[PDB]
Amino acid sequence: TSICTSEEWQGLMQFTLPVRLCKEIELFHFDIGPFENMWPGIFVYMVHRSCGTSCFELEKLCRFIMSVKKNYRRVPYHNWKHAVTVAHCMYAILQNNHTLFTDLERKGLLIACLCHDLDHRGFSNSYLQKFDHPLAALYSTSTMEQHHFSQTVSILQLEGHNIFSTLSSSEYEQVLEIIRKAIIATDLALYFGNRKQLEEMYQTGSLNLNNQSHRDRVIGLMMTACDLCSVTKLWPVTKLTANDIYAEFWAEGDEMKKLGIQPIPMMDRDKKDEVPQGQLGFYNAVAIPCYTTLTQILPPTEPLLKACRDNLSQWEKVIRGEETATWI
Ligand SMILES: c1cnc2cc(OCc3ccc4ccccc4n3)ccc2c1
Numbered sequence: 001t002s003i004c005t006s007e008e009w010q011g012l013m014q015f016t017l018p019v020r021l022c023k024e025i026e027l028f029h030f031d032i033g034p035f036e037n038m039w040p041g042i043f044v045y046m047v048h049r050s051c052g053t054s055c056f057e058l059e060k061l062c063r064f065i066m067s068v069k070k071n072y073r074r075v076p077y078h079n080w081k082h083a084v085t086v087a088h089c090m091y092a093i094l095q096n097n098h099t100l101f102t103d104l105e106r107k108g109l110l111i112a113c114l115c116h117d118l119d120h121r122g123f124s125n126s127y128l129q130k131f132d133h134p135l136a137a138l139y140s141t142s143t144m145e146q147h148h149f150s151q152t153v154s155i156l157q158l159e160g161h162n163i164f165s166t167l168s169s170s171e172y173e174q175v176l177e178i179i180r181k182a183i184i185a186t187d188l189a190l191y192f193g194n195r196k197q198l199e200e201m202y203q204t205g206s207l208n209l210n211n212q213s214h215r216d217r218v219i220g221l222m223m224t225a226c227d228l229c230s231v232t233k234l235w236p237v238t239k240l241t242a243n244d245i246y247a248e249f250w251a252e253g254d255e256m257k258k259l260g261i262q263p264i265p266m267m268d269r270d271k272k273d274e275v276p277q278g279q280l281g282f283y284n285a286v287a288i289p290c291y292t293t294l295t296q297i298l299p300p301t302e303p304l305l306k307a308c309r310d311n312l313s314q315w316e317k318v319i320r321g322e323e324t325a326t327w328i
């Protein structure tokens with residue numbers, strides 16, 4: 001765990017979001033990509049419009065944010081960009097559904113999204129268990145997810161970083177648990193059951209957000225939606241981000257070959273031809289159902305589902321040989 005430098009949180013306190021962005025940030029399809037310098041500022045702005053200017057001690061908030069930035073490794077995908085991207089999707093979700101969730105829930109969930117991948121090394125859960133990494137000995141299921149949480153608390157336990165002090169002793173317990181549950185649900189392993197349970201609950205009518213066990217699951221699916229949201233952007237954004245994920249997947253695949261295990265095709269750079277059909281199946285198996293169920297549960301989330309459908313069709317388009325442009 002590391003600390004931020006002097007003028008990083010001081011310069012951020014001076015940052016203010018330009019006019020055109022104010023109205024664009026509210027949209028689901030919005031893309032933070034073209035604005036790297038403004039990322040930590042976008043997050044502050046997002047926290048202030050969602051739970052207020054006095055939602056956190058500003059000084060702590062910045063120290064915390066910039067320390068979260070430093071604990072994202074320079075990997076091609078599971079990095080600072082991803083963190084802020086997923087947080088923004090949470091903001092859009094919360095704004096479209098504000099009164100459904102509490103002021104504790106919203107600050108918990110924005111923090112969870114920012115922190116959900118902390119200290120990722122570009123290696124999957126599968127990898128870490130197959131090669132008995134200590135993290136797999138320490139964390140027997142949801143290996144990385146449990147580590148990210150641990151990392152969050154550790155960052156909170158730094159000098160002047162604890163943004164959750166002014167709340168309570170019980171409320172401190174509650175929000176951490178919200179954040180713990182939120183991060184754990186970004187393990188895609190858990191996603192499949194969760195979505196299917198939520199789907200059965202909706203189609204029977206039994207779903208009740210006043211039921212704390214039902215609430216957790218809705219929040220879970222919210223986390224998944226945020227996590228996968230690269231697939232809800234405009235086609236060229238979606239395509240670009242795919243490059244980054246494969247750069248990560250293939251480097252892992254490279255490690256397995258060195259230890260004499262032929263990797264899964266998804267992680268095998270010599271199986272590039274299989275990318276479009278692979279993406280298709282992911283859309284069909286994971287993304288579609290996710291945004292579909294999430295739309296039923298939270299009707300104002302429909303644009304996510306809509307954009308996701310556009311990209312499936314784009315990938316279908318690539319398969320038929322109708323691909324255009326194709327810049328890298
Ligand atoms: C977030 C965003 N996108 C994701 C895409 C995923 O799958 C793509 C995929 C699947 C199978 C493949 C097989 C061969 C080549 C590429 C293949 N490519 C899997 C997980 C993802 C998580």
Ligand code: NI
Nearest residue numbers: 116117144186
């Ligand atoms: Ni993750």
Ligand code: NI
Nearest residue numbers: 082116117227
């Ligand atoms: Ni993630």
